From Swiss-Prot, chains A, B:
It is linked to In Alzheimer disease, the neuronal cytoskeleton in the brain is progressively disrupted and replaced by tangles of paired helical filaments (PHF) and straight filaments, mainly composed of hyperphosphorylated forms of TAU (PHF-TAU or AD P-TAU). O-GlcNAcylation is greatly reduced in Alzheimer disease brain cerebral cortex leading to an increase in TAU/MAPT phosphorylations. Frontotemporal dementia 1: A form of dementia characterized by pathologic finding of frontotemporal lobar degeneration, presenile dementia with behavioral changes, deterioration of cognitive capacities and loss of memory. In some cases, parkinsonian symptoms are prominent. Neuropathological changes include frontotemporal atrophy often associated with atrophy of the basal ganglia, substantia nigra, amygdala. In most cases, protein tau deposits are found in glial cells and/or neurons. This is Microtubule-associated protein tau. Interacts with MARK1, MARK2, MARK3 and MARK4. Interacts with PSMC2 through SQSTM1. Interacts with SQSTM1 when polyubiquitinated. Interacts with FKBP4. Binds to CSNK1D. Interacts with SGK1. Interacts with PIN1. Interacts with LRRK2. Interacts with LRP1, leading to endocytosis; this interaction is reduced in the presence of LRPAP1/RAP. Promotes microtubule assembly and stability, and might be involved in the establishment and maintenance of neuronal polarity. The C-terminus binds axonal microtubules while the N-terminus binds neural plasma membrane components, suggesting that tau functions as a linker protein between both. Axonal polarity is predetermined by TAU/MAPT localization (in the neuronal cell) in the domain of the cell body defined by the centrosome. The short isoforms allow plasticity of the cytoskeleton whereas the longer isoforms may preferentially play a role in its stabilization. It comes from Homo sapiens (Human). The modification N6,N6-dimethyllysine is found at K8. Expressed in neurons. Isoform PNS-tau is expressed in the peripheral nervous system while the others are expressed in the central nervous system. Phosphorylation at serine and threonine residues in S-P or T-P motifs by proline-directed protein kinases (PDPK1, CDK1, CDK5, GSK3, MAPK) (only 2-3 sites per protein in interphase, seven-fold increase in mitosis, and in the form associated with paired helical filaments (PHF-tau)), and at serine residues in K-X-G-S motifs by MAP/microtubule affinity-regulating kinase (MARK1, MARK2, MARK3 or MARK4), causing detachment from microtubules, and their disassembly. Phosphorylation decreases with age. Coiled coil: none annotated. Glycans are attached at K44, K50, K66. The modification Phosphoserine is found at S2, S21, S49, S53. The record marks K8, K14, K18, K28, K37, K40, K67, K72 as: Not glycated. The modification N6-acetyllysine is found at K8, K14, K18, K28, K40, K44, K66.
Length: 77, 77
């Protein structure tokens, strides 16, 4: 009782950008005073906890192009 | 009395060709016979003078794509 399998994907994709100018970008957030206090905190298993976070990000990619792929092949008997 | 100038050209142009085949070209001009006559001849100040010319050209560029640009910025006070 034979079994043949042929997983032949083919991918010739493009993910592209041209851009003449990226320019004159400004990021002036005013100051936010923040105060953080606790008695007790418990984080038992697999926790992701952002708490009392002040963040300024200025992410300015000339490209910033992403591609993801995920080939899975699972055989079971 | 200030003067600013900012000459920021940006050029992302393309000038392009694909071609599958050029293929069979023939250039069989028959015979050419000609006469030019004068007594006396002079030239001055950068004269550019083709005379009595028999020419055969077979110019076959696989891609004959041309680009010219000319940025000029000219200040006087």
């Amino acid at each position: 009782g034979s079994v043949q399998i042929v997983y032949k994907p083919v991918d010739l994709s493009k993910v592209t950008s041209k851009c003449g100018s990226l320019g004159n970008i400004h990021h002036k957030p005013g100051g936010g005073q923040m105060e953080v206090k606790s008695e007790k905190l418990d984080f038992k298993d697999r926790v992701q906890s952002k708490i009392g976070s002040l963040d300024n990000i200025t992410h300015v990619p000339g490209g910033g192009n992403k591609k993801i792929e995920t080939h899975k092949l699972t055989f079971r008997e």
